Amino acid sequence: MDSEPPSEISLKNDLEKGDVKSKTEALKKVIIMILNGEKLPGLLMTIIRFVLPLQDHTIKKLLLVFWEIVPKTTPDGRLLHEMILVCDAYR
Amino acid sequence: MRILMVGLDGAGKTTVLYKLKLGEVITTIPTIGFNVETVQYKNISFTVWDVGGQDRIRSLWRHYYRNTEGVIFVVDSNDRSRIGEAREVMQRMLNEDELRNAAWLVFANKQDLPEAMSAAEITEKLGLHSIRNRPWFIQATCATSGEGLYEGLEWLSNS
Amino acid sequence: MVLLAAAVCTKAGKAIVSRQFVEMTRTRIEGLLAAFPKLMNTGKQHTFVETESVRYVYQPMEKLYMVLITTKNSNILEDLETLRLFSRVIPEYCRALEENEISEHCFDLIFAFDEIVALGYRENVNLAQIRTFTE
């Protein structure tokens, strides 16, 4: 997904699927559309839900990636708190 | 079947989960995070998300709401100071659109303790009678003995 | 920051994958990469070329440009060296540069970018180091 700004409905579906690869790919697809500068908050609860505690680095690294380029803007699955869904289980 | 089990810290959520999964009473630590496990009961495989109840984590439950078929809300029946707080958490949880049709099962837990509030008392304090929009049930439990646990899984499976 | 962005480009006229260390160059990243890397960063087959008041360091790989951009600078050796280390890391993820395969490993490359250059200051990376993260 080079740059496709309407694809956020499919990404939500792909983000949790019971297959780790699909989830990684989805979250990756979100990153590439934001970096170009395209739509991203719809997904947030889905994105945040699988990855949170785990020591399994790749999804964690992917989520960690998305928190330095848009964390502030996206708020469906995060909202505003001191120990946000950016860092609460990332302790 | 997808299940979300929450409640305030120390209610007994992880004790419940691992009693169900291992038939064992484990020595818990506060859960900073979740535990997720699959349990077989009578041809149903329940995937239970036990999400820690301390404040930081409490702020995160909303990410586990979506796709939830049923909600186990664990209450420490012996703690009277925090029952109002439980009531407050649970009431706005009931207002959550992703939790809209999910089956609501309250566990009044630590029923084994001498001064534990009764399930009826808890039902009045949590305002359970006022839920008309979906299925609810309250069950007295003791997670250490295992009492009431499977009666819960039973009720849940009949959603 | 001294290093605005670290960016992999396709001279299709767009930034294929790119990294904004702290929220500044979002959409900005794509326009710079899209115009300048097409002209060889406006180069002549010189690693440093500066255009529209932004220093572009680059290496061509196919129809693609691996690009480092700065608009400030601390030392000569350093800018090349982060780009260089990046160029060891990029074929591990994408088998040279190529827009479709670059696109698929947005996460891989992007993560390396954060790791390599942190808050615009050129840290160091290596293919083994990269592994712990994507594990």
Which run of H or of E encompasses C70? strand C64-70
Contacts with C21 from chain A: Cβ below 8 Å: 68
Number of residues in chain A: 91
Q: How far is A8 from chain C (nearest CA, A)?
A: 17
Sign of CA dihedral C71, C75, C76, C79: negative
Strand partners, C9: C65
CB interface of A with B, residues 46-65, below 8 Å: 46, 48-49, 52-53
What is the C-alpha separation between C55 and A11, in angstroms, rounded?
36
Please report where in the chains the tokens 């097409």 appear, as a residue. C38
What is the C-alpha separation between B20 and B152, in angstroms, rounded?
11
| Alpha helices (H) along chain C | 27-35, 76-94, 99-104, 106-116, 127-133
A45 close contact with B: CB closer than 8 A: yes
What is the C-alpha separation between B71 and B48, in angstroms, rounded?
9
Identity of the residue numbered A75: P
The three-state secondary structure class of B130 is helix
Number of residues in chain C: 135
Which run of H or of E encompasses A13? helix A8-15
A71 close contact with B: CB closer than 8 A: no
What is the C-alpha separation between C41 and C32, in angstroms, rounded?
10
B54 close contact with A: CB closer than 8 A: no
Question: What's the distance, CA C48 to chain centroid?
Answer: 14
**B54 annotated active-site:** yes
CA-closest candidate to residue A19, choices A57, A52, A59: A59
What is the C-alpha separation between B79 and A15, in angstroms, rounded?
39
Solved by what technique?
cryo-EM
What is the C-alpha separation between B74 and C108, in angstroms, rounded?
41
Q: A65, exposed or middle or buried, with CB in 10 Å at 0-12, 13-18, 19+?
A: buried
What is the C-alpha separation between B113 and B116, in angstroms, rounded?
5
B57 close contact with A: CB closer than 8 A: yes
3-state helix, strand, coil in chain B (%, to 5): 35, 25, 40
Query: Within 13 Å, how many C-alpha atoms sit on residue B32's CB side?
Result: 7
CB B70 within 8 A of CB B4: yes
Q: What spatial distance separates the first Cα and last Cα of chain C, rounded to whole Å?
A: 29
What is the C-alpha separation between B47 and B68, in angstroms, rounded?
10
Resolution (A): 13.0
> Which strand ranges, in their side-by-side order, compose the sheet holding B136-140?
B34-41, B44-51, B2-7, B70-76, B103-109, B136-140
Strand partners, B74: B7, B107
Which run of H or of E encompasses C122? strand C121-122
Select from A83, A90, A91 the residue whose CB has the most chain B CBs within 10 Å, as the one to mutate to test that interface: A83
Q: What are the contacts of A80-85 at 24+ separation with CB within 8 A?
A: A81/B59, A83/B56, A83/B59, A84/B59, A85/A48, A85/A52, A85/B60, A85/B63
CB C92 within 8 A of CB C54: no
Which run of H or of E encompasses C39? none
Q: Can you say which residues of B are annotated as belonging to the binding site?
A: 8-15, 31, 53, 109-112, 143-144
- Which member of C21, C99, C114 has the closest CB to residue A2? C99
Q: Which residue of chain C has the CA closest to A38?
A: C27
* Interchain CB contacts (distance < 8 Å): A and C: 74
Select from C107, C114, C116, C117 the residue whose CB has the most chain A CBs within 10 Å, as the one to mutate to test that interface: C107
How crowded is residue C88: how many other Cβ atoms within 10 Å of its Cβ? 12
CB C68 within 8 A of CB C82: yes
Contacts with B33 from chain A: Cβ below 8 Å: 52-53, 89
A86 close contact with B: CB closer than 8 A: no
What is the C-alpha separation between C13 and B103, in angstroms, rounded?
52
Say which DSSP state B118 is in: P
Contact flag C114-A35 (C-beta cutoff 8 Å): no
Would you state the structure tokens that stand for residue C105, as one six-digit string? 């490993």
What is the C-alpha separation between C51 and A2, in angstroms, rounded?
25
What is the C-alpha separation between C47 and C92, in angstroms, rounded?
22
Identity of the residue numbered B110: K
Question: What's the distance, CA C91 to chain centroid?
Answer: 13
Q: What are the contacts of A81-86 at 24+ separation with CB within 8 A?
A: A81/B59, A83/B56, A83/B59, A84/B59, A85/A48, A85/A52, A85/B60, A85/B63
What is the C-alpha separation between B143 and B21, in angstroms, rounded?
12
Which run of H or of E encompasses C59? strand C54-61
